[PDB]
Design a binder for this molecule. Structure first.
Ligand code: 03B
Ligand code: ZN
Ligand code: ZN
Ligand code: ZN
Ligand code: ZN
Length: 150
């Protein structure tokens, strides 16, 4: 409880849909307090790209991500991102990484990867990040911290 929560799937699809919309795409092209969390994540991901733009490179070539890639390859990269533990900034970097991997996959004519990356992100969020998030005050704590720094 939970095996795979709908709220974790929704957070991921809403974030990825936003990043793909910024590149002119609809989520439907790739796949078949809550509003405040969605908006804070959108804003934090946009700020993360302005501050750490150099990291937004040819991710699918650097990580050899193809239509043959399975979940454990994605988990190894994200475990590197969280190698020294979890914090809010690293969670924003994780969402941003998934968004950039989706955008790059579409650019490299590997549209098939988008729904897969969404599922891998929702799995990692559910299994390896939600326990930390709940222990550290929940998503409404992030909304408060982000909004107050803003
Ligand atoms: C393996 C691996 C990687 C790897 O190993 O590192 C990386 C990788 C690559 C580059 C960068 C990073 N980062 C950079 C940042 N960093 C960090 C910094 C500070 C804190 N401290 S904090 O928690 O107190 C804090 C402080 C401030 C704010 N926010 C204010 C809002 C102000 N505003 C309201 C005015 C500022 S904006 C903002 C600032 C920082 C983070 C978010 C938003 C927030 N916050 O959450 O908003 C939280 C904690 C963590 C963690 C890692 C990872 C990738 C990767 C590859 C490609 C792509 Cl595309 C993505 C990822 N990969 C794959
Ligand atoms: Zn939603
Ligand atoms: Zn961008
Ligand atoms: Zn795992
Ligand atoms: Zn913990």
């Amino acid at each position: 409880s939970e095996f795979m929560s709908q709220s974790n799937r929704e957070l991921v699809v809403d974030f990825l849909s936003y990043k793909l919309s910024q590149k002119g795409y609809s989520w439907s092209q790739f796949s078949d307090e809550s509003e405040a969390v969605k908006q804070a994540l959108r804003e934090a991901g946009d700020e993360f790209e302005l501050r750490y733009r150099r990291a937004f490179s040819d991710l699918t070539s650097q990580l050899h991500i193809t239509p043959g890639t399975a979940y454990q390859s994605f988990e190894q990269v994200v475990n590197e991102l969280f190698r020294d533990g979890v914090n809010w900034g690293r969670i924003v970097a994780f969402f941003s990484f998934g968004g950039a991997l989706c955008v790059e996959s579409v650019d490299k004519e590997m549209q098939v990867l988008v729904s897969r990356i969404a599922a891998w992100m929702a799995t990692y969020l559910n299994d390896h990040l939600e326990p930390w998030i709940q222990e550290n005050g929940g998503w409404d704590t992030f909304v408060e911290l982000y909004g107050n720094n803003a």
